[PDB]
RNA sequence: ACCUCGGGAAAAGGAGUGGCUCUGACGGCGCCGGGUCAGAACUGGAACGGACGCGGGGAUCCCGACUGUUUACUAGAAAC
RNA sequence: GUGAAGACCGGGAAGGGGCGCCCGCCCGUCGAACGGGGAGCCGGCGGAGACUCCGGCAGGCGCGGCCCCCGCGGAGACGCCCGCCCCCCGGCGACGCGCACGGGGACCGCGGCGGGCGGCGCCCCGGCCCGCGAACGCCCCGCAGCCCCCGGACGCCUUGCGCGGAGAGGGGGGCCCGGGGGCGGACCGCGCGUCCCCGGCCGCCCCUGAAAAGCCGGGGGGCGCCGGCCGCGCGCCGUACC
């Protein structure tokens, strides 16, 4: 009648990295599986919006295709930000010519 | 006797500034060849909060003139500056809020803040919330500009000294009552161990010159000479006058 | 409605404490701090305070420096005008 | 552990890649529709559940003499 | 009526963002939206060679939403629309041969120093 | 009463409360799933928060506005 | 740099490396068995231990052999098995408190069926015990959120809100989701709570809630990788018990 359990971690102090999830094992016992803190996906350098297409896994265990977006400045800039950058650059050069002409 | 609180404070040690988690030293961009001739363009990446400062700070990113990267400056933010503003620091800079120009260039009557006491000091006067200095006059023969410090005192500073156009943001912060002792503890925790304050007439004879008797009284006059000794200067130092009055 | 008849509208929390003068002053500052202000870009009344001096428009996604309890302070409004008049005059 | 792609990839791995042992575990708990073939590789143990004993036989046919079978 | 065959534009969305592209046909306005057939430089020539010059050009022929392309003053007039068509490009194959032909057409121009504004990369400062 | 209009206030002061047998509500429909809120009869040495848990209240006067802090091992105060 | 010294104080001082060069102001192999970190699960075994043994099954990081070989798809948001070095720019590491509300997991309780009991003066299909499924690997879903494409409006919506000509609703999509299912590893239904995690908010502050190692994108230059498969390796110290 007791499903109380004991700590899996080196010390009992329950910090952010010391959280457990209880499941029943094949042998009918409650086991404490560790819950890893979810790493977070890259956020756009300009703006602050999470970059679409990249999973929230540590980048080392991801695979190169998964850790990249097929776009110029892909994991750095979101598409709206990139289109603003492209447009701003093109317009500046076009106004400069008008100043000369 | 015992060393008084003022004496114990100068060794730091518990009375040292709580400077952890403070963004950095807010300072005007360094004077450079491109500042001295022409203007450098920066973009305000962010406007954030300094732990012990009421006035908001601002991360402005300038291009690296020396090399190839981008350099980030921390500036006390004038009111009205926004993220994605273009701030120009230069001798040829337009008079818009945020821009840093030498005080000779700044016209008379202009509200300025983060003014340099001496050229290339990267910031000194008018750095607190709401505070500003005003350009009073320029002597173009002495290359000096009179400014009125927020105190009212008029200072003649070199025309070369730089200042950020505008009034520091955070204006009217002390208008709100602290209301509770708790709100005070939160403000001082971000600053230094100076609060709570025990009156010297509350302390025993050893601890303070005001000390203690059968009744809580200042004993001799609170006014102390300017040439007092370091543990004796405790009340009103060198008071020209005391008391509430008209004006 | 009008749950608080007097000007204890935001200061009902303080209850019977702190004195009338403090509560009256807090009414003005508190109402100003939690008010929505109009962003000079979004032009939408969505600016709210993040910290003392920092105001963000939720739609425009732009942060602007401001007064501790109001997006715009009276001294600042005057300074912007003085700087504009002096600027236009210099050019 | 994983499920091998039909006997398509299972027989391809059996032909060359590690196939240290195959186990024809029919009658897992005496249950029907139960021929489970468990290929041991270096990378993973793979299991294809096959509908009939005759279906299992076609995959057992062509099992290498070098490939080792065990039956449960 | 800005959108016309022979307009140089800057692609703004997709993998071809920031590239310069030329419209060879203005696809008729339809429920999908307004679209045009765009042929443009996916990759610029190359780097050092010998000294500065004493090396390949890649092109993309894809249909693209006009909203995703910013109009510019440049031209790059070529006959072009004889080979590039709606049945082609959509076709798997034929498009690859059409791309190959455009790649050669582009290299001839760059070697003969024609249409340099089109053949220079738009600098996107971060 | 008073009040700084937030309080005072659980002011003060009354009345009921069990068990049985029901009856409505409420989402739930292929009707299926709730356990609370009412209302009702019939009961019973004149019982029912039946143990347990769990403000006595009011009228003032003096201090200190308040929540806080303090003499570990005689002073928690009106002192700080 | 001081001081009679013991000692104390400290950036302004030709401060890093191979060959031809090149690049380069200037310290922590200090400090945390709770902070950050590349990766562990199940079943068993012993008189004394186990995330350590043993049996299975996996994950991490490197060293070699062999083979292969330098991008495509989309209207877009994305998708897809993918190079490395330098310099620049960025990201992840990385973060407060709260009332609610939602979603999972465990727990709990209720039936049913299957197995095992106990009592029985009368009743009892009314009592009790048991009915197990881990990391991991593929495939599929996953609210809210964030985007895309058409198009051009009083609507869409929450518990509370909030949202929309800077583009709502509607229609079709993309992404993330510490999760769920299916198979592999290897009993069936239902409900109310509790606890823990998580989400989208909303509130709050003269209070704004660490840093770095490491890892990974991006721009520009250089420049050839990349993978796959098969072996091997993983040293040091702590580990009884209270």
Task: Give short descriptive properties of this protein.
part of a larger assembly, 5 chains, C: 91 residues, alpha+beta, 3 strands, E: 126 residues, five-stranded antiparallel sheet, 2 helices, 17% helix, RNA-binding
Q: How would you describe the overall organization of this protein?
A:
This is part of a larger assembly, with chains A (101 residues), B (247 residues), C (91 residues), D (72 residues) and E (126 residues). In chain A, strands 1-2 form a two-stranded antiparallel sheet. Chain A has one helix spanning 79-100, and strands at residues 20-24, 30-34. Chain A is 22% helix and 10% strand. Chain B has helices at 5-9, 33-36, 181-189, and strands at residues 39-46, 57-63, 70-76, 86-90, 100-102, 111-113, 133-139, 144-148, 154-158, 162-165, 223-224, 236-237. With 72 residues, chain D is an alpha+beta fold. Chain D has helices at 8-15, 53-60; strands spanning 21-26, 35-40, 45-50, 68-71. A four-stranded mixed sheet of chain D has the order 3-2-1-4. In chain D, strand 2 and strand 3 form a beta hairpin. Chain D is globular. In chain E, strands 4-3-2-1-5 form a five-stranded antiparallel sheet, covered by helices on one side. In chain E, strand 1 and strand 2 form a beta hairpin. Chain E starts with 7 loop residues before the first strand and ends in a 15-residue tail after the last helix. Chain A binds two RNA strands through strand 1 and strand 2. Chain E: Pfam families: KOW, Ribosomal_L27e. Chain E: Belongs to the eukaryotic ribosomal protein eL27 family. Chain E: This is Ribosomal protein L27. Chain E: GO terms for molecular function: structural constituent of ribosome. Chain E: InterPro entries: KOW, Ribosomal_eL27, Ribosomal_eL27_KOW, Ribosomal_eL27_sf, Translation_prot_SH3-like_sf. Chain A: Mg(2+) binds at residue 53.
Summarize the structure.
Chain B is mainly β and 247 residues long.
How are the SSEs placed, and which strands pair?
This is part of a larger assembly, with chains A (101 residues), B (247 residues), C (91 residues), D (72 residues) and E (126 residues).
Chain B: H1 5-9, H2 33-36, E1 39-46, E2 57-63, E3 70-76, E4 86-90, E5 100-102, E6 111-113, E7 133-139, E8 144-148, E9 154-158, E10 162-165, H3 181-189, E11 223-224, E12 236-237
Parallel strand pairs in B: 11-12
Antiparallel strand pairs in B: 1-2, 1-4, 2-3, 5-10, 6-7, 6-10, 7-8, 8-9
Chain C: H1 19-33, E1 47-51, E2 54-57, E3 62-65, H2 74-90
Antiparallel strand pairs in C: 1-2, 2-3
Chain D: H1 8-15, E1 21-26, E2 35-40, E3 45-50, H2 53-60, E4 68-71
Parallel strand pairs in D: 1-4
Antiparallel strand pairs in D: 1-2, 2-3
Chain A binds two RNA strands through strand 1 and strand 2.
Organism (chain D): Giardia intestinalis (strain ATCC 50803 / WB clone C6)
GO biological process, one term (chain D): translation
Keywords (chain D): Ribonucleoprotein, Ribosomal protein
């Amino acid at each position: 009648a007791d499903c109380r359990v004991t700590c899996r971690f080196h010390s009992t102090y329950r910090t952010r990295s010391k959280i457990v999830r209880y499941k029943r094992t094949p042998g009918n016992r409650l086991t404490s599986l560790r819950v890893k803190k979810l790493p977070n996906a890259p956020h756009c350098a300009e703006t602050g919006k999470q970059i679409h297409g990249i999973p929230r896994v540590i980048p080392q265990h991801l695979t190169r295709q998964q850790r990249k977006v097929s776009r110029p400045y892909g994991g750095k800039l979101c598409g709206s930000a990139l289109r603003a950058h492209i447009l701003e650059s093109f317009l500046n050069e076009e106004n400069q010519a008008l100043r000369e002409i | 006797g015992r060393r008084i609180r003022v004496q114990r404070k100068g060794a730091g040690s518990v009375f040292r500034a709580h400077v952890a988690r403070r963004l950095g030293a807010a300072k005007l961009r360094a004077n450079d060849f491109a500042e001295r001739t022409g203007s450098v363009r920066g973009v305000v990446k962010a406007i954030l909060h300094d732990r012990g400062r009421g006035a908001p700070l601002a991360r402005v990113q300038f291009p690296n003139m020396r090399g190839e990267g981008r350099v980030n400056e921390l500036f006390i933010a004038p009111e009205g500056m926004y993220t994605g503003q273009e701030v120009f620091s230069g001798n040829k800079a337009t008079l818009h809020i945020g821009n840093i120009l030498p005080v000779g260039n700044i016209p008379e009557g202009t509200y300025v803040c983060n003014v340099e006491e001496k050229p290339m000091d990267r910031g000194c006067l008018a750095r607190a919330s709401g505070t500003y200095c005003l350009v009073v006059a320029h002597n173009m023969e002495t290359n000096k500009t009179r400014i009125r410090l927020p105190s009212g005192q008029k200072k003649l500073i070199s025309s070369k000294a730089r200042a950020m156009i505008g009034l520091v943001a955070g204006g009217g912060r002390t208008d709100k009552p602290l209301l509770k002792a708790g709100n005070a503890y939160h403000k001082y925790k971000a600053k230094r161990n100076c609060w709570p304050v025990v009156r010297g007439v509350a302390m025993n004879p050893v601890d303070h010159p005001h000390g203690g008797g059968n009744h809580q009284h200042i004993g001799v006059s609170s006014c102390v000479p300017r040439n007092a000794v370091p543990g004796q200067k405790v009340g009103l130092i060198a008071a020209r006058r005391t008391g509430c009055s008209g004006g | 409605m009008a749950k608080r008849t007097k000007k204890v509208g935001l200061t009902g929390k303080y209850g019977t404490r702190y004195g009338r003068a403090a509560r009256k002053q807090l009414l003005k500052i508190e109402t100003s701090q939690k008010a929505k202000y109009t962003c000079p870009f979004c032009a939408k009344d969505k600016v709210r305070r993040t910290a003392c001096g920092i105001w963000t428009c939720r739609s425009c996604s732009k942060t602007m420096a401001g007064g501790a309890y109001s997006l715009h302070t009276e001294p600042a409004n005057a300074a912007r005008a003085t700087i504009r008049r002096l600027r236009l005059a210099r050019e | 552990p994983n499920t091998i792609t039909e006997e398509n990839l299972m027989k391809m791995i059996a032909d060359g890649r590690g196939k240290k042992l195959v186990v024809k575990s029919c009658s897992k708990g005496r249950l029907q529709g139960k021929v489970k073939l468990k290929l041991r590789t270096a990378k993973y143990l793979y299991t294809l559940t096959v509908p009939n004993a005759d279906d299992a036989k076609s995959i057992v046919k062509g099992c290498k003499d070098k490939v080792e079978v065990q039956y449960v | 009526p800005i959108i016309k065959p022979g307009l140089v534009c800057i692609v703004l969305q997709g993998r071809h963002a920031g590239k310069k592209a030329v419209i060879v046909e203005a696809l008729p306005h339809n429920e999908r939206g307004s679209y045009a057939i765009v042929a443009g430089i996916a990759a610029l020539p190359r780097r050092i060679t010998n000294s500065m010059s004493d090396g390949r050009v890649r092109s993309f022929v894809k249909c693209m939403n006009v909203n995703h392309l910013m109009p510019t003053s440049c031209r790059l007039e070529n006959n072009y629309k004889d080979f590039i068509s709606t049945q082609t490009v959509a076709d798997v194959t034929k498009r690859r041969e059409i791309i190959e032909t455009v790649n050669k057409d582009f290299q001839r121009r760059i070697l003969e120093h024609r249409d340099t504004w089109f053949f220079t990369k738009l600098p996107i400062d971060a």
